[PDB]
Design a protein around this ligand. Structure first.
Ligand SMILES: [Mn+2]
Ligand SMILES: [Mn+2]
Ligand SMILES: [Mn+2]
Length: 391
């Protein structure tokens, strides 16, 4: 192998400006990093700048450098959707024609009617909410009736809440598996069905760690599957395992924050493995993008950037670091959905003695998967063009 280890970091939702097809999605004008940089009066990301972030595009506080540490470009999404699953599945070598749906006004009556009819249970609520706002509103009615609280969120999710002493935990799981089957339907296709058991009494409800997420498997065998099948390590960090429903994963390390994610990345740098370490930094998306909070988003990007020098210090000559994103989520954009944007790509190894250069723009996120596959000599994905030889 050219590289013994590849460290792939997805800065979830960290877009670098509207894609050519942005108008289809109502995303004209979107620019995640650029709008954050303006809000911050100049982003302080000296380490990403050293890698070549500003060579991809100049933004407030983010300038080009004469000699970027590694190679740089941006990537265009080919798949139909702009959701997390679509982006990640594309990154690992697929093409996804059918988009996952988000439901800001709640779910169609048709879906919920079928769920009632298959379960013999009433459904109440139907609408976006936090799992503490909706329990305050409807938790008592749930206890007294045995009905199911259905709700959504800013992401492609269907969430089902029931009190554990009224609807047995095992029943709630069965109901969620039924819903997972009903939602394999392009009209209603949610990324995740989520069991949200709760306990307590009116005015004091709390969700339990008995939460269960029901994900769809990727629509194809990914580069991860191929690495696992050839006895390589595939270490998933953060939401990565859930995003791929475990497919091709050999070890999974849960994280609770972006900083915890960077700690786990450092943990893998200390591991003797051969294969792929794959991190998702989700806070950008979950805490800041969807909540339209550019200040919090800017601060998180600066916290992330400050962690990078330790990573640079630990990378070996036969290590490759890849930094990218899975879509945009512009915190100054209307509504609460993702934004259809290019994503940055930075590729760095300490073995790059003369530093990096610009890569041709990547026409699909699958160029990452193709590059990983070629590095490790496993079956090449159906989609994507490797840039391994360019590095
Ligand atoms: Mn939009
Ligand atoms: Mn995402
Ligand atoms: Mn999201």
């Amino acid at each position: 192998n050219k590289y013994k280890r590849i460290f792939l970091v997805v800065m979830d939702s960290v877009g670098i400006g509207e894609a050519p097809d942005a108008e289809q999605f109502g995303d004209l004008g979107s620019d995640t990093i650029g709008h954050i940089a303006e809000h911050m009066n100049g982003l302080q990301m000296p380490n990403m700048v050293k890698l070549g972030l500003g060579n991809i595009r100049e933004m407030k506080g983010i300038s080009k450098v004469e000699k970027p540490l590694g190679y740089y470009t941006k990537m265009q999404e080919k798949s139909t959707g702009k959701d997390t699953m679509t982006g990640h599945w594309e990154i690992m070598g697929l093409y996804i024609d059918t988009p996952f749906q988000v439901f800001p006004e709640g779910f169609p009556k048709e879906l919920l009617d079928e769920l009632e009819e298959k379960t013999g249970r009433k459904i109440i609520g139907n609408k976006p909410a936090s799992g503490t706002e909706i329990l305050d509103e409807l938790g008592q009615e749930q206890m007294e009736t045995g009905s199911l609280i259905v709700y959504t969120g800013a992401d492609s999710v269907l969430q089902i809440a029931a009190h554990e002493e009224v609807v047995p935990l095992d029943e709630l799981y069965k109901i969620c598996k039924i819903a997972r089957e009903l939602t394999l339907d392009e009209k209603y296709m949610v990324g995740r069905v989520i069991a949200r058991p709760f306990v307590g009494e009116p005015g004091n409800f709390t969700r339990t760690p008995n939460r269960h997420d029901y994900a769809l498997k990727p629509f194809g065998r990914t580069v991860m599957n191929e690495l696992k099948d050839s006895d390589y390590d595939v270490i998933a960090i953060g939401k990565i395992s859930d995003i791929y429903d475990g497919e091709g994963v050999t070890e999974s390390l849960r994280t609770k924050s972006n900083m915890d994610g960077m700690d786990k990345l450092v943990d893998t740098l200390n591991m003797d493995f051969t294969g792929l370490s794959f991190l998702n930094l989700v806070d950008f998306d979950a805490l800041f993008g969807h909540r339209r909070d550019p200040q919090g988003y800017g601060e998180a990007l600066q916290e992330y950037d400050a962690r990078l020098p330790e990573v640079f210090a630990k990378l070996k000559e036969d290590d490759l670091l890849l930094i990218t994103a899975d879509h945009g989520n512009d915190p100054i954009h209307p509504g609460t959905d993702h934004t259809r944007e290019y994503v940055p790509l930075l590729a760095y190894s300490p073995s790059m003695k003369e530093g990096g250069q610009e890569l041709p723009l990547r026409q699909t996120f699958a160029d990452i998967g193709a590059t990983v596959a070629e590095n490790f000599g496993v079956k090449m994905p159906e989609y994507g063009t490797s840039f391994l030889n360019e590095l």
